[PDB]
């Protein structure tokens, strides 16, 4: 549950393993499920273990999902494994300006 009076930035992740074998080795057998809940957001995640194109040697992927939790609101992680949990939440400080370039700073 969010304490402060600014919105919260929550981020979690799912580990789509290289194969059902690795997924069983890590989180046990049986279908895996991660439901994420919130007053303004509700979704269900099921990992799809498969041998993706081998990026740098590892065929397994970890994807990240995010939500903004308004003040005095609760987020509920019900899960069964294959969950990359967060330790800290993020709170935006003020205002800023983002750019993209390769040129030197001055």
């Amino acid at each position, epitope marked *: 549950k969010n304490t402060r009076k600014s919105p919260a930035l929550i981020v979690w992740g799912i580990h789509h393993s290289v194969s*059902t*074998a*690795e997924q*069983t*080795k890590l989180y046990g*057998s049986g279908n895996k499920l991660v439901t994420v809940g919130s007053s303004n957001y509700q979704q269900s995640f099921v990992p799809s273990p498969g041998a993706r194109p081998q990026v740098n040697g*590892l065929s397994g992927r970890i994807d990240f999902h995010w939500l903004m939790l308004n003040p005095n609101d609760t987020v509920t992680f019900s899960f069964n494994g294959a969950f990359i949990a967060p330790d800290r939440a993020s709170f935006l400080r003020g205002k800023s300006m983002g750019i993209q370039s390769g040129v030197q700073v001055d």
Partner: antibody
Amino acid sequence: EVQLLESGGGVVQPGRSLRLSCAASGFTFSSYAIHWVRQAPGKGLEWVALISYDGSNKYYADSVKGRFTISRDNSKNTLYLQMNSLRAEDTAVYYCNGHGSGGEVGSNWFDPWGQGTLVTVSS
Amino acid sequence: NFMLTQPHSVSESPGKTVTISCTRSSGSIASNYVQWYQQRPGSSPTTVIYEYNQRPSGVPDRFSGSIDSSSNSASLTISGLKTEDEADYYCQSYDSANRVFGGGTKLTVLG
């Protein structure tokens, strides 16, 4: 340099008890889970027991439940198998064998075995 | 829950290829990893294959692992047999946390 040292083997009678120990040296013992795997003479391998890296979980074979009790001392890097209420069939060579991911998922294959300690149970 | 059945014995001439099967009685062979162990007489077992096909550092290229989901089996195959290979071989898979060993397969190279 990595090695496992099984000790406590000998001849016993049925109905009695026994205790086995494994001395680990050469790796981070506190991180891997450890297994007891035996093999009767002329027979094949049989997984006996396992204990987790932090001793929270202990898993025993269905053919040995109730009698054997696994334990570990990480401060001493020692494994213990309590074989009370022995039977005639438990006669076998007893290997301690480390088998676990150890917190890493890349995890080059790490599965060390000892030399095995003979446990003869004749009448 | 399940048992791993492998043939009691097998033999083949040196230089020829040989394969050993490991059939799981209940449950998909792809559900849990399968390790292939080699045990020489008197010696402690040494892993030849892990995670169905992975060759640990030291094992020559002759050893290969395979999975046959159709017959729900796992096969360890050696090409170009050598008399050193004459040992017993055990396949091992996993029930939920417990390990399960095969019945053993005495591989003798023809002399």
